[PDB]
Symmetry: D2
Subunit: 262 residues, 4 copies
């Protein structure tokens, strides 16, 4: 099959990449970083995130694998010592799919609606001023949020920034998204739900500005300043990310290993 390998860029990951390429040379495998079918990431979850967004227009044609040259990652969950055994089995596997989050940003006249895909989460903050947005759920006005910002998370993203904000961890088999608050203002006049909210497929969460229309929007690692925003729309994506599965590594064990002990 066609394949490519991305590297964190340090010495450990570059040599590992060069050794796997050499191992792949002993099989019917063609290196192609334009239309690969197997994408291998060597580094951390950040390296895997970059590999995902690098190829996010061929997600239905690609199965990802992550190798962690540092600590255990949630996406890079195979040790460097398994690389050789990984080359062999990649050459001759099952696939598991995780849900993704779609963000739609609409603007006033002059700019076209832009859409982004997130594997971890999409957050909105203000640009300088105070963050105030009306939160609309399936066209129902739910609340007026005042605070630092909001975070909408994928299931596999619940162990990342979502977790730091008090969000719940969701098994990635659940097709959903989770909205969490960042330092809500709650008094007698300002009211938010406080609790995290978990939304099923086909529920649209819409943030609508009340005064300032400039927001700092971050999709996974990338953070962009958007100007003259009319609406931010969240929903579970119809696209899914595909992982090549070469052994049983249960999500709850991955959670245990990363947070309890290993």
């Amino acid at each position: 099959m066609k394949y490519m390998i991305t590297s964190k860029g340090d010495e450990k990951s570059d040599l590992l990449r060069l050794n796997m390429i050499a191992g792949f040379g002993e099989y019917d495998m063609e290196y192609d970083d334009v239309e690969p079918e197997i994408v291998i990431s060597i580094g951390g979850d950040g390296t895997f995130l970059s590999a995902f967004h690098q190829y996010e227009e061929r997600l239905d044609e690609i199965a990802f694998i992550g190798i962690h040259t540092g600590h255990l990652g949630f996406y890079a969950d195979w040790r460097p010592a398994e690389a050789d055994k990984l080359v062999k089995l990649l050459a001759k596997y099952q696939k598991v799919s995780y849900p993704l989050l779609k963000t739609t940003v609409k603007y006033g006249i002059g700019k076209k609606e832009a859409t982004y895909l997130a594997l971890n989460e999409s957050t909105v903050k203000s640009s300088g001023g105070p963050f105030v947005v009306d939160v609309v759920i399936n066209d129902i006005h739910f609340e007026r949020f005042r605070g630092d910002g909001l975070c909408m998370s994928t299931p596999s993203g619940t162990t990342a920034y979502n977790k730091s904000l008090g969000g719940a961890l969701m098994h990635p088999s659940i097709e959903a998204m989770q909205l969490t608050e960042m330092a809500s203002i709650n008094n007698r006049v300002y009211r938010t739900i406080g609790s995290p909210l978990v939304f099923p497929k086909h529920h649209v969460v819409s943030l609508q500005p009340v005064n300032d229309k400039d927001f700092q929007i971050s999709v996974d690692h990338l953070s962009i300043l958007h100007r003259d925003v009319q609406e931010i729309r969240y929903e579970v994506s119809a696209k899914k990310i595909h992982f090549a599965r070469f052994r049983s590594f249960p999500f709850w064990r991955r959670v245990h290993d990363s947070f309890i002990e290993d």
Copy 2:
């Protein structure tokens, strides 16, 4: 159809019940509190909870309706003023189904395994002593919990005790259950996940005692002392509760009305 009406017992709910019965007398409706097909609760969510557990062996044969004579309930979500219009449409509807939580309690020799169905949540605390349990997820040892106790919640139960413990609110269309912690002990030697955990259908969460085998187990309102416990097992029930739907009252609007404003 066969029907019955349960009342909170106060004057307001008894008269409302008597008026609806009289209204039902003007239609082909037979009062039967043994094998009803329509079960109407008049009071609060507590009254509705009692009506649910009263008939939990015929859940596939019953459609529930709740009338709130006090504030808006999450299950009793129709005002007393709609009773007459409710009698008419009940006489001539759609059904919506919410998931339920199954709790299995196993003991040592002398007592048989007992199973309970919860509409809101099932909690475990200690009986006097300290609460320490090993949390096992699909036979994987996840953590050793020390604290006040644990709460496993249904989706519709997430707005109840789950919410008070920092849990997330889940739309009831998501077939899942949510485990929350009660005052976890976390230091350098004792470690819990801290975050709430959301489990899909067919994941089994198992609590296993480490020293004391006596626990206070509460299913919805009812709290029982169980002795010589060997295991407590949580999973999404295969049974579902059925609601008669006579108008659109979205869950997220029900959340807004109960917590933000009405």
Copy 3:
């Protein structure tokens, strides 16, 4: 000086106690467990807690020391290896004082007001039914609390149950007490402050029942069922606990060692 040693009761702590007694025999030290001036605890914070309440009517005449035969305790903060060097310096020190919490329980006719001293915290829960109390601060009605219960903590108790409820850690030099909530119910009709509250010396926090007058009150380890309660009053005690200081072991380092790493 007069002295006594209490032991956890296991083999390790009993031998350690017997060796220190033998070491004390080589100095002008008289064992007296009725009117000691130096009270040594060997075990954990639980053993130290028992030693405190055992002698809480002579707190101004006693300097405490704790030896931890298990992990580092916040009160038993000297390793067993320092016992011999501890015997020598005890024989020939400075004193540091931590604030205490006073709880007053008032009843109806038939029972006299009872007062308790806490080194860690004093908590109130319901007895079976729901917990609802009016919280009164210096005779000002502050809130009506509904939930599992409330916890009032000393400064040195902030690392114990207070910490598990989201409370803040306070340096023990601050003469104060901290009230934390246990699973507050907050909706459109029920409102609590949510945040922990820190009170200075001479502020009186008063819990007043609204329906049930039976509460389970726990002072440190001891939990008592009180019946026909008219008021529960919290305030910083005028009494202080005295520790014999034989080296610099800063509180913030004790916190670091117990929760970050050692």
Copy 4:
């Protein structure tokens, strides 16, 4: 006495200011906005904050008063209807003092150490990149913090941004400061205390960069980008803010009115 009045700038506050000035003209009072002894703020807590920082080099010579033309403020806690009765009593009072927070920012060669005074809080975030700092308490290395940032709060600031981050509310008579975390990263390799920390007078909390030396530092409303930072130091200020007291308005009642009900 010498006095001045600052206004929110809207129509309601400007007329109120003009009426009080006219009322002051009927007494021996000289308007002076250079060396006033009584500083009156008309607007919200933001207007009062600006009045504080406008005159923060004569805090020992000034007694502040706040009038809230909108909702009740924690510093602007007198209604516009009391303005006339306020002019009379200002003309003929007691003073109460709240503690302040001092922030010291040190840089590399080229820039001198800068110090700031906060009435509410001082926060540190990163500038673009990830926020990682070593937290040092009285020269003791306490933790390495990774997250969004940290917030150090005054006692009267505990009801503001501190409260939104889970901090405790402290009565302003307690001379202390409170450090809270902003979205801490906690796994098996990264550890923070999680709990808020309350520090007494003379404890120095020092943030030390580990990689990036550029931080966005906010003192009350003002947020500055500081470059090439070597250290950020927090401590309770020796200066105090003085309020003119014309009636009993207890802090806990002010908390009740702003968050529970009024």
